[PDB]
Design a protein around this ligand. Structure first.
Ligand SMILES: Cc1cn([C@H]2C[C@H](O)[C@@H](COP(=O)(O)OP(=O)(O)OP(=O)(O)O)O2)c(=O)[nH]c1=O
Ligand SMILES: Cc1cn([C@H]2C[C@H](O)[C@@H](COP(=O)(O)OP(=O)(O)OP(=O)(O)O)O2)c(=O)[nH]c1=O
Ligand SMILES: Cc1cn([C@H]2C[C@H](O)[C@@H](COP(=O)(O)OP(=O)(O)OP(=O)(O)O)O2)c(=O)[nH]c1=O
Ligand SMILES: Cc1cn([C@H]2C[C@H](O)[C@@H](COP(=O)(O)OP(=O)(O)OP(=O)(O)O)O2)c(=O)[nH]c1=O
Ligand SMILES: Cc1cn([C@H]2C[C@H](O)[C@@H](COP(=O)(O)OP(=O)(O)OP(=O)(O)O)O2)c(=O)[nH]c1=O
Ligand SMILES: Cc1cn([C@H]2C[C@H](O)[C@@H](COP(=O)(O)OP(=O)(O)OP(=O)(O)O)O2)c(=O)[nH]c1=O
Ligand SMILES: Cc1cn([C@H]2C[C@H](O)[C@@H](COP(=O)(O)OP(=O)(O)OP(=O)(O)O)O2)c(=O)[nH]c1=O
Ligand SMILES: Cc1cn([C@H]2C[C@H](O)[C@@H](COP(=O)(O)OP(=O)(O)OP(=O)(O)O)O2)c(=O)[nH]c1=O
Lengths: 289, 289, 289, 289
């Protein structure tokens, strides 16, 4: 079965971005010309995932709901659910248990921005895996902040460590994961770590130990950004602005992606673009069709 | 009488920023490391103004209230009032009539960033002005978007025009205004312009016609920025980032300004910083004391 | 025959960048952390091309020679030749006639930056092409500045126009070209255009008219940037900075590419890095091995 | 006597910016739209200094000479001299001894960028000091890299330390200094420090100990940037670009400054702008007059 369900974890406390996240969800902050959540949303769409559960805080879940609605305007089926407190990424599968049911499911972090040639191609392989799980390894400047994958001399991934003191490599596990149905049972049996969180890295270690984990390499030609600090947030925005100004094309425009994947037709695009044509966003869409 | 009351117009529509501003007020958007409204708030505070009225939309007013509270944490007296519809800058004096009472009052637009050596000094002259009004003239590249001031050969401001098809100069009127109590009656008597808005420029033209308007020059040494477009918003963030990274000092940090102007003392800063010391903002405040 | 020779057109006038380019060649300007010419040089190297001719102005050729030497430090064979006057891109094949001999040859503009996942792969098809030529089509916002390709309903490129008043599409021809040996005779027979230049576009039109031109699409997933204006130059630098800061990996580092493609081995890298280990570039190279 | 002579130290090895400074002097690198040296040059001009000695490396001194000439086109008198090796900032006064003669003299580092309201006013005070010296203290993020000034509780500067291990404050001494004639004798008697350089900080300590040093504060409202790293270089450029795009005015344009200070007239500006009107720089100047 092709993965057809996805969860966007869009909550957290956002303490590092304080005070910008004091009155606005990190996932609603702009990345140049569109809300941050539009990016991970576009990533799932490109992967062919149209049934998506969005999870956020008790305060912000209603806000995403208000901005996105049921997502039928983009040919999607959006559902919402609250995570009482940011107790860990793995909790996404406990909260989303009903939604997931007996199906495979992808997980993408609400602040993750992916961009690059063949990204869709890269995700399809994971989407079509009958069972097991697929995560992606990306070379980053400071491994210590993430789940770090260790490889042997042959290039085989042999272990994963959450925020190691001494990273065994500079390869971090990205915020995009693809799982078969067994992840729900794994999450339910996890016990909090010393830092009191349900670790998704423990989930991934389990798949690895069962020999069911594909650590797909996401090359340097791809861009994987997260907006962890004020600094990285602005760099991400400059990155996006440069590409869009140069190409005259938009990065992660859901309306566009839905149109090109035939989720909606030109008439639907025209209606959505109407209210947005007082600036380039809407004019872009009108021109697109 | 020194101007001791101020109003921040923090509402509006933000069409030029859709869909960014669909689910986030322009004034809540981050400008590098803090919400946009911290800048105009700081500008008033630096002028010695502590009693401030915050006006926004029906939906966003409560959000600013949640973000700022009554402002006592910073030695301020903040109040809030809703602007039913974004019918014009001048409407700020109608909505804020009770708040203003019989006193002088300043108005600053929520998306305006002012920065420069001796900015406090420049404002102090306006703050101490007995009667009449003071506005500021700043040289910009696209004057047509603003209220534009015409000067005669001697350099005396002789007329103002809102968005003229043909600017008589490249000097725009900034979003910081100081008025005496007569502005309230002026606003109550304005008729909407062809574009259906109560024009702050008509108020300024009235003071100028009565010979009561001081058009103070705000030189090139100062930075006056707007964040109405994707472009201006990212440029402002980069601008602020450069300054702060270099100085190790923050631009428009309310806690810091409140401390340096003795609105609050060290213990209060220490108390505010504690629960925030986990992020750089907290560390910044502790280093300060 | 695989394309094993390349030419970098690194001269020109740079009027749009005066006075920046009055005392510094556009190709010597930094793009974040390395001179501009390192990028096109890397592009050729990634295509497996080691024998490269660098063409510049009478004044600047010696500077590039001092910067790059004979390239043996990176397992390359670099040569230099002066372009008396910036009389057109196509003049590159007249000046480089002896260098080319009877072989195939690639041409890359000195101010062109290419980046993206699988870029090497895309070039390899051109590199292996038996005869004819290959150029790349990229979607941009201001096509009028470039050679523009027209496609029919089926998507087949049917015509090219240099700076048309009315672009027939938004696809510009990039600054990376692959040619068979017949390009030399074509260039020697060109007559200057009304703007008095030997047009590379006329050469491309010739291959297209003989049905020997492959117009390969370079998708939105790739970044193709120019640095002809103040604006494009700073945007490119910010673009590169974001990528590198995030990855802890450098874009177009000749030493690294030479190492990864086995042009040189570890000892050589270690020897080059030693005297540079005092700065981050040296540290970067040592970390690499 | 008003200081009427100035020296721009524009040499050094630039190792930190390697490889960008391998084939281009750090002082010829662009800062958005003009060579870096145009900035310190503009600073001396604003201070009323028209007789300036430019010092660089054996290789680059001729390049500045070629770009700037005798500077009479801007109403200046430029002289050039080589510093065999970067043996320290204080060496500027030994090399420039003949040039200085019996007069007072200012020193500005070739990579220093100063900007802010009243900068000229700030410098005039130092320019008019009969004797002694004036340096400026600026709060920076990392004091350790500069000469650091320690102050007592009253705000009086009491000591200076070059690159202290434990900075006694976050105030660094900027790259702009104003001296009376006694600095030449001081420089001649200095002995190299442990790091083998003639320290300008020892010069400044001498003035301080003789009670002849004015440590003028350069407030946070001013911007003082140096382009030490690739990162700071790009931030400086973004800073300049934002201000210029917003104001429609240029920062540190020598042609403009010479015109406004009446060093040259409109006709001279028109002639210089002619060759530069293929881009905004020249058009700016033409419009200016
Ligand atoms: C942990 C945790 C994170 N998040 C989502 C929010 C982010 O988009 C994504 C990334 O993890 P984090 O970035 O670390 O989320 P965070 O906001 O807690 O970061 P910090 O407070 O240190 O600044 O995960 C949740 O929704 N729930 C959670 O329980
Ligand atoms: C390898 C390598 C690639 N490149 C740039 C060239 C391409 O635009 C981009 C991608 O080339 P590719 O390496 O072939 O694509 P990749 O994303 O698979 O890279 P990897 O898996 O090895 O991390 O990287 C370099 O600049 N330096 C290098 O050392
Ligand atoms: C008009 C109007 C503006 N504003 C404040 C919001 C902004 O901070 C400041 C500047 O006004 P504008 O920016 O021009 O109003 P806007 O936010 O609707 O922008 P757009 O053209 O994209 O729709 O004035 C109000 O609060 N109330 C109003 O009635
Ligand atoms: C005049 C002038 C100043 N400057 C820079 C130097 C200072 O850092 C900054 C401000 O110096 P000042 O010009 O004297 O301050 P200002 O803000 O009053 O400028 P004005 O009223 O003339 O618009 O401007 C230039 O770069 N070019 C110029 O032509
Ligand atoms: C024309 C021409 C360009 N060039 C190279 C330089 C650039 O890297 C690349 C792009 O050409 P252009 O950039 O358009 O040439 P230019 O540098 O003169 O730009 P400007 O319009 O500001 O004067 O081609 C040459 O080397 N020789 C030439 O005869
Ligand atoms: C199509 C499409 C892709 N993408 C992003 C997703 C990927 O990171 C990147 C490239 O995916 P791909 O589109 O499949 O790669 P491409 O370079 O071949 O694109 P094309 O030939 O259609 O111009 O573009 C969008 O943001 N919006 C879109 O409408
Ligand atoms: C030391 C020294 C510096 N310089 C000038 C060059 C710079 O504009 C200015 C600033 O000092 P530095 O910046 O440290 O000069 P640098 O190029 O040696 O820096 P680094 O090699 O560590 O990257 O001083 C000289 O001209 N001569 C000298 O002897
Ligand atoms: C003090 C202070 C000023 N400001 C901004 C407001 C002004 O635009 C700019 C300059 O205000 P001023 O402080 O009066 O000018 P300054 O350059 O003399 O500052 P100082 O000597 O104290 O370092 O700094 C803050 O944002 N926060 C602060 O805590």
């Amino acid at each position: 079965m092709k993965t057809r369900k996805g969860i966007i974890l869009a909550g957290g406390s956002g303490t590092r971005l304080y005070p910008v996240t004091m009155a606005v969800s990190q996932q609603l902050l702009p990345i140049y010309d569109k809300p941050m959540i539009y990016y991970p949303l576009s990533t799932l769409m490109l992967a062919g995932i149209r049934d998506i559960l969005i999870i956020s805080t008790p305060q912000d879940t209603p806000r995403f709901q208000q901005l996105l609605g049921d997502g039928s305007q983009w040919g999607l089926n959006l559902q919402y659910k609250v995570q009482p407190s940011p107790d860990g990424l793995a909790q996404a599968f406990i909260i989303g248990e009903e939604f997931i049911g007996h199906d495979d499911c992808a997980l993408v972090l609400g602040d993750n921005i992916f961009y690059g040639h063949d990204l869709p191609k890269l995700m399809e392989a994971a989407v079509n895996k009958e069972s097991g799980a697929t995560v992606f390894a990306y070379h980053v400047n400071d491994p210590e902040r993430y789940g770090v994958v260790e490889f042997d001399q042959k290039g085989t991934a042999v272990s994963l460590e959450e925020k190691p003191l001494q990273p065994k490599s500079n390869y971090a596990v990205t915020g995009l994961y693809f799982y078969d149905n067994s992840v729900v049972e794994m999450a339910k049996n996890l016990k909090p770590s010393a830092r009191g969180e349900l670790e998704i890295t423990d989930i991934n270690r389990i798949y690895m130990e069962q020999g069911r984990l594909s650590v797909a390499m996401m090359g340097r030609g791809y861009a994987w950004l997260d907006t962890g600090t004020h600094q990285s947030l602005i760099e991400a925005s400059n990155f996006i602005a440069t590409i869009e100004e140069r190409q005259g094309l938009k990065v992660s425009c859901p309306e566009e992606i839905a149109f090109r994947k035939n989720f909606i037709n030109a008439q639907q695009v025209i209606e959505l673009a109407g209210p947005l044509s007082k600036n380039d966003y809407g004019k872009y869409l009108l021109k697109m069709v």
